[PDB]
Amino acid sequence: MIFPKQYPIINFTTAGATVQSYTNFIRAVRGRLTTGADVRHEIPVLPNRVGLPINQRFILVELSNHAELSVTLALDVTNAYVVGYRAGNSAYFFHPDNQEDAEAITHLFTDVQNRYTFAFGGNYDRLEQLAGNLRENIELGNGPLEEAISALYYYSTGGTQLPTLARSFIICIQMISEAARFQYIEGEMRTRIRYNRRSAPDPSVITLENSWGRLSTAIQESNQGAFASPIQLQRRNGSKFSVYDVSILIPIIALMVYRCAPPPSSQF
Ligand SMILES: NC(=O)c1cccc2c1-c1ccccc1C2=O
Ligand SMILES: [Cl-]
Ligand SMILES: [Cl-]
Ligand SMILES: [Cl-]
Ligand SMILES: [Cl-]
Ligand SMILES: [Cl-]
Ligand SMILES: [Cl-]
Ligand SMILES: [Cl-]
Ligand SMILES: [Cl-]
Ligand SMILES: [Cl-]
Ligand SMILES: [Cl-]
C-alpha cells in the first residue's frame, strides 16, 4: 500500500521577480514533474497516466503577487498542464475528459469548503473564446501574471468576470505549463521579465504550444531521431517550416507526454 501524502509544492511570486527567480521556479516545476529515469533523445518523458499512484499524479504551484494575494494551481504531472486552482475556501477544476481523470481530481484541494468543476475544459480554443481574445492578442509577462493572480483570487467572491478568468488561465498556463514544456518558451518569458516587458506570444510560440503532443509522438516514434512524418511549425514571422528530426528540437523542448502503442494482434 501507499499512504496518502501531500503533493509537492513549488512557489513563485511576481513581487520582486527576476530572471533568476523565474528560471529557478521553472527548474523546480520540471524537477517535480519528472523522475529523471525516463529520458529519450536527452528530453525527459513525463510519467505515464496509466497506473500512476495518486500521490504522484499532481504538483501544486503557489503563486503570490505584489497585491499580497495567493492562489494555488494544480498541474497534472502526465502533461504539465493546469487542471484547476484553489484560493481561500474554494477550488475550481476544468472539465475532465474522462471518468478516470474526474476521479483523480477528487484528491486535489481536499480541505476546501467549496469545490466546483467547470462545464468547460482548459483547452486554448475554449479559453480564447471565453476570454474574447486569441493567444496572439493576450500579453504575457510579469505584469499580466500579477493581475491574473488577483483575478483568480477574487473569482469566488464575484470580483472577476468570466472573460477575465479565462484570460488569466491563458496567462498562467503559458507562463508555467508551456514554459516547463519548452526551454524556448521559458526563454521567451525570461526575456519579458528581464525587460519588464508585456507582449503577446509570436507564431513560433503559439505553434510550439499547439504542436507539443504531436512533437512528443514524433520524437518517441522516431527512428534514431528521424521522424516518420514531418511536423510543421512556424517561424517568428509566421512562415511555415517542417521539422524532420529530433536534433533541432533538443534545445527547444524540455518535456514530453508519455507515448506507447499496444502490440500488434498475435492471432487471427
Ligand atoms: N482585471 C483583472 O485582472 C482583475 C480582476 C479581478 C480582481 C482584480 C484584477 C486586478 C488587476 C490589477 C490589480 C488588481 C486587481 C484585482 O485584485
Ligand atoms: Cl489521497
Ligand atoms: Cl518587482
Ligand atoms: Cl472533485
Ligand atoms: Cl491538494
Ligand atoms: Cl471545452
Ligand atoms: Cl486548443
Ligand atoms: Cl483576438
Ligand atoms: Cl495585460
Ligand atoms: Cl503584444
Ligand atoms: Cl529537421
Side-chain angles (χ1 to χ4, degrees), residues 124 135 174 177-179 181-188 201-216 219 231-236 241 243 248-255:
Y124 296 122
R135 279 168 283 166
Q174 293 182 85
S177 300
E178 304 288 8
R181 289 168 172 187
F182 292 100
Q183 297 100 138
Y184 183 86
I185 297 183
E186 179 199 352
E188 288 287 305
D202 77 26
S204 69
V205 171
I206 292 166
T207 62
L208 284 169
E209 294 172 352
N210 289 342
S211 301
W212 181 72
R214 288 187 292 276
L215 288 168
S216 297
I219 293 161
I231 302 296
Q232 188 173 82
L233 295 174
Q234 288 175 27
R235 299 197 186 79
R236 295 190 185 278
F241 70 106
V243 175
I248 198 179
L249 302 172
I250 290 170
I252 302 306
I253 187 163
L255 303 169

Side-chain angles (χ1 to χ4, degrees), residues 10-30:
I10 303 106
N11 308 81
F12 182 69
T13 182
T14 56
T18 59
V19 172
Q20 189 68 263
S21 72
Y22 181 78
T23 300
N24 290 351
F25 162 61
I26 297 302
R27 177 186 291 110
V29 173
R30 290 185 188 132

Side-chain angles (χ1 to χ4, degrees), residues 33-196 198-244:
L33 286 171
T34 56
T35 64
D38 193 1
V39 180
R40 308 194 209 166
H41 301 285
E42 305 178 45
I43 303 157
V45 182
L46 292 167
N48 181 1
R49 62 189 296 281
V50 174
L52 188 63
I54 197 58
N55 286 344
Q56 294 173 41
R57 183 55 189 277
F58 301 111
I59 65 175
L60 306 183
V61 170
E62 184 274 315
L63 298 175
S64 293
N65 68 181
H66 288 94
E68 299 177 33
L69 307 174
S70 177
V71 303
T72 298
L73 309 183
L75 278 44
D76 188 331
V77 305
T78 67
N79 65 7
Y81 208 82
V82 175
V83 302
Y85 82 101
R86 180 258 185 83
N89 76 346
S90 294
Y92 296 89
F93 303 99
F94 296 125
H95 196 78
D97 292 345
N98 55 69
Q99 206 68 314
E100 291 77 13
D101 290 348
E103 191 282 335
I105 63 163
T106 68
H107 301 259
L108 283 168
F109 306 136
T110 53
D111 65 324
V112 300
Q113 183 187 351
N114 307 300
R115 320 176 62 72
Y116 310 91
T117 297
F118 296 119
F120 54 88
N123 58 277
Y124 296 122
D125 287 359
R126 178 66 66 219
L127 294 179
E128 288 170 339
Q129 285 182 304
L130 294 171
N133 283 289
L134 300 175
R135 279 168 283 166
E136 66 192 55
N137 293 129
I138 296 168
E139 291 85 357
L140 304 172
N142 200 54
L145 185 57
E146 166 75 35
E147 301 183 334
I149 291 161
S150 296
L152 265 63
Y153 182 88
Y154 284 115
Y155 180 69
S156 72
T157 201
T160 308
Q161 300 183 273
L162 180 56
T164 303
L165 185 75
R167 186 188 185 101
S168 298
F169 286 138
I170 290 167
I171 292 159
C172 290
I173 291 162
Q174 293 182 85
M175 294 189 74
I176 302 169
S177 300
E178 304 288 8
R181 289 168 172 187
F182 292 100
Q183 297 100 138
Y184 183 86
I185 297 183
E186 179 199 352
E188 288 287 305
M189 300 306 105
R190 284 163 64 150
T191 297
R192 284 162 176 77
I193 291 165
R194 181 177 303 288
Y195 292 102
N196 192 31
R198 65 184 275 271
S199 64
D202 77 26
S204 69
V205 171
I206 292 166
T207 62
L208 284 169
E209 294 172 352
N210 289 342
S211 301
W212 181 72
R214 288 187 292 276
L215 288 168
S216 297
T217 297
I219 293 161
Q220 286 170 77
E221 292 187 349
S222 71
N223 174 50
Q224 305 186 357
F227 294 178
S229 54
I231 302 296
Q232 188 173 82
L233 295 174
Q234 288 175 27
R235 299 197 186 79
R236 295 190 185 278
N237 74 349
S239 63
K240 294 161 174 172
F241 70 106
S242 288
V243 175
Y244 295 94

